[PDB]
Design a protein around this ligand. Sequence first.
Ligand SMILES: O=c1oc2c(O)c(O)cc3c(=O)oc4c(O)c(O)cc1c4c23
Length: 332
Amino acid sequence: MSGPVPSRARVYTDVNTHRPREYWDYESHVVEWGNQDDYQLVRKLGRGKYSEVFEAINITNNEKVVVKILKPVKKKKIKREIKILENLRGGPNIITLADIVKDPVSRTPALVFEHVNNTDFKQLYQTLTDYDIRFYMYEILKALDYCHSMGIMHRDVKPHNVMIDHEHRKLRLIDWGLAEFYHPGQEYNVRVASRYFKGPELLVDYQMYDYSLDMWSLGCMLASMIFRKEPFFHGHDNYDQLVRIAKVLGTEDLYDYIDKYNIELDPRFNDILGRHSRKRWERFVHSENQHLVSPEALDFLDKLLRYDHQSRLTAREAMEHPYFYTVVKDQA
Ligand SMILES: O=c1oc2c(O)c(O)cc3c(=O)oc4c(O)c(O)cc1c4c23
């Protein structure tokens, strides 16, 4: 009946605003295509959605690389990823776009990324130590703070998008194919991110979201890691996703969130959330995960997983949490 209350990023609100138009205007951006023959496809890695990736080698200098060929997708979408990748290139822990080559495989070309010898995310989880997790979480935070400071929301933060070469302690945040430029007052598509990592704002159709979305997804990751339940919030659909969350954060804070921003609750919700108390994080601590848990980790996770997007810690203040006190601190 009314309408929802507007919202804006609590930090880096207008980093794109006064930057040259070329920076964020990706649909008019045109690319100087690299050469397809410079790379030799060696093996097909994994199995990608609307895109297939391969292990490969640059013929001109035998450097190992990963070629990502794009499938039947709209131009402006390819441009968006390319433009975002080029802009963030050089930033801490951001995957480096080594090249973009033209190839008539389906009206779509290919993206060349630096090679990351990452351990199968599924087996790696099970071998990390308390320090490894604090270290890696810190590295991801560096990537988010930098990208957010460069005006980009990743929108698909999850274990599958964090390549980790554990032997080299090298970490890269990948798949910027859903990333978007933040503009205050803008209403974005709530599709983005994987179900299990979607912030409440996406689940209740709140379109004026921001960088803080990535912080919720990061929280879901953290939770799955320290508690060893991957994923932590496992819902069946958007509606069930929020229910899984409420069974932990409670329903009261959820109801307070929707009222604060005057959110139109869909018929499918009024009776599905029910009534749940706020559960304590210590409840999920058992003999299989206690070594990756600590009071600061719990306090940290608690400041990340908040219904209200504006209340969640920003990447930078997350890096200032005691949870990361032990982590290196050499700043270089
Ligand atoms: O930069 C990437 O490196 C990768 C890999 O090294 C890999 O082994 C598998 C993948 C993969 O499955 O999907 C990807 C994406 O959708 C994407 O946008 C970027 C990358 C990968 C990727």
